Amino acid sequence: MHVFPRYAAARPEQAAELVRSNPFALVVSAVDGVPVATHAPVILEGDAVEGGTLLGHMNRANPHWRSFASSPDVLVVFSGPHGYVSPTVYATDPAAPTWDYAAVHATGRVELAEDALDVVERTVAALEAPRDPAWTPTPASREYFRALLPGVVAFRVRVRTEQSMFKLSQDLDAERYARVREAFAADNPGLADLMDRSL
Amino acid sequence: MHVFPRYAAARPEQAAELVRSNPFALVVSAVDGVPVATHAPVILEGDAVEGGTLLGHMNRANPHWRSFASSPDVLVVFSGPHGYVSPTVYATDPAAPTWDYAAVHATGRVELAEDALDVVERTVAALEAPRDPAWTPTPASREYFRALLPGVVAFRVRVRTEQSMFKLSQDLDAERYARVREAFAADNPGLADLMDRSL
Ligand code: HEM
Ligand code: HEM
Numbered sequence A, B: 001m002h003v004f005p006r007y008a009a010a011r012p013e014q015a016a017e018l019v020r021s022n023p024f025a026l027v028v029s030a031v032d033g034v035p036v037a038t039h040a041p042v043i044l045e046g047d048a049v050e051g052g053t054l055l056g057h058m059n060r061a062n063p064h065w066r067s068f069a070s071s072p073d074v075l076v077v078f079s080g081p082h083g084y085v086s087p088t089v090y091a092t093d094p095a096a097p098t099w100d101y102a103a104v105h106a107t108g109r110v111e112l113a114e115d116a117l118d119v120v121e122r123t124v125a126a127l128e129a130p131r132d133p134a135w136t137p138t139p140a141s142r143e144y145f146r147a148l149l150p151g152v153v154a155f156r157v158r159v160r161t162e163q164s165m166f167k168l169s170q171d172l173d174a175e176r177y178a179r180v181r182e183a184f185a186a187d188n189p190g191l192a193d194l195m196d197r198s199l
Helices: A013-021 A063-068 A116-128 A139-151 A174-187 A189-197 B013-021 B063-068 B116-128 B139-151 B174-187 B189-197
Strands: A024-031 A034-045 A053-059 A073-085 A098-112 A152-167 B024-031 B034-045 B053-059 B073-085 B098-112 B152-167
Touching: A013 A034, A013 A073, A013 A098, A013 A152, A024 A053, A024 A063, A024 B024, A024 B034, A024 B073, A034 A063, A034 A116, A034 B024, A034 B073, A034 B098, A053 A116, A063 A098, A063 A152, A073 A152, A073 A174, A073 A189, A073 B024, A073 B034, A098 A189, A098 B034, A116 A139, A116 A152, A139 A152, A174 A189, B013 B034, B013 B073, B013 B098, B013 B152, B024 B053, B024 B063, B034 B063, B034 B116, B053 B116, B063 B098, B063 B152, B073 B152, B073 B174, B073 B189, B098 B189, B116 B139, B116 B152, B139 B152, B174 B189
Parallel strands: none
Antiparallel strands: A024 A034, A024 A073, A034 A053, A053 A152, A073 A098, A098 A152, B024 B034, B024 B073, B034 B053, B053 B152, B073 B098, B098 B152
């Protein structure tokens, strides 16, 4: 998780946009000295990642959460769009490939969430609200949710350290940049949209 | 990283297909007790993940590799296609959302690769070969590579434990499955193709 100056966020607001737009995160902790990772929806409470709170849930029968007891520092990785950059795109004889991407890394202490229902219900609102149509939990769904609670574990993470990666070829020259962006405009509109938000 | 019986790989070959098809991985280790993660290309040497070797490189100025010295067990996460599953897709009144995805998790001891040039040159071949056109390193590119070596660190991982996730709604009934697959066929062909390789 090293970040060059050139591939940094322009406004610290950029990290939170990425977080809110890509909630299917990776929750990582040191179970017994070895990294263990769960894929889970995690949402952001607050305006900023640093000094904000993340909220997530996983399967209770997923034993990963039982090792949150010690409350070790965890890493939550949010992954935005990404894409391979082939030298055939550059069309230059001395060249080397790379991979373009955006990511937000949040490190902090995890604790177990009191109100699992709040967490899951807020996770619903977070994901369904930009979708059209927005799924709004029916009362019977809220009752269904109530019945599913014994099978979920929710958690919180107080973000102690945030770190953002916006590796969008912006160190390239004007000519090689154009080929990269136009090549991604075709096949990877999320990535190409991001190369514009970096200018 | 818990896997229900229902969302498992049908043939252990399925893990390696996913690995080879999604080499932009996440390399995770316990630096000082806290997870640290780097996004890097990692390729598979061998027919199987378990008992195979992974090979990767990162930036030398990325200090993450300096903590591979102790050679702790690392986790490499390979992420295949994924997608949110909205209850509006099910069209059923008592419902709850989820996220469908495929991933391979490889845990083993990392060591520093002697032949960084082999690693990067094999990483090139791995990525460019299915692309049309395939970028084949020009001699001057191979010379360029030679000049870039002081700026890269390559590594190896002996996979001690493999674990695969193929969460593709296959526990759904026939009617709800159809809506999910057809909804992904439209917007997420990689995911929908995978729901067929699970049958
Ligand atoms: C709003 C968007 C939601 C998403 C994207 C989502 C996604 C997921 C995912 C990916 C898992 C697997 C975690 C693991 O592997 O351990 C999971 C577990 C679980 N969550 Fe959710 N969930 C959402 C909302 C809810 C709601 C509203 C409830 C209501 C109680 C709920 C209850 C559960 C249950 C019972 C499980 C365990 C069963 C299973 O593995 O599916 N979730 N959820
Ligand atoms: C074949 C596909 C390749 C991909 C997808 C790729 C991708 C990447 C990525 C994502 C990084 C950043 C790692 C970090 O953040 O620490 C990196 C670092 C680096 N790799 Fe590669 N690489 C490839 C081939 C090569 C080759 C053939 C060389 C030849 C020596 C090379 C040399 C380097 C160098 C010098 C750096 C540091 C400069 C930088 O940050 O870009 N790579 N590579």
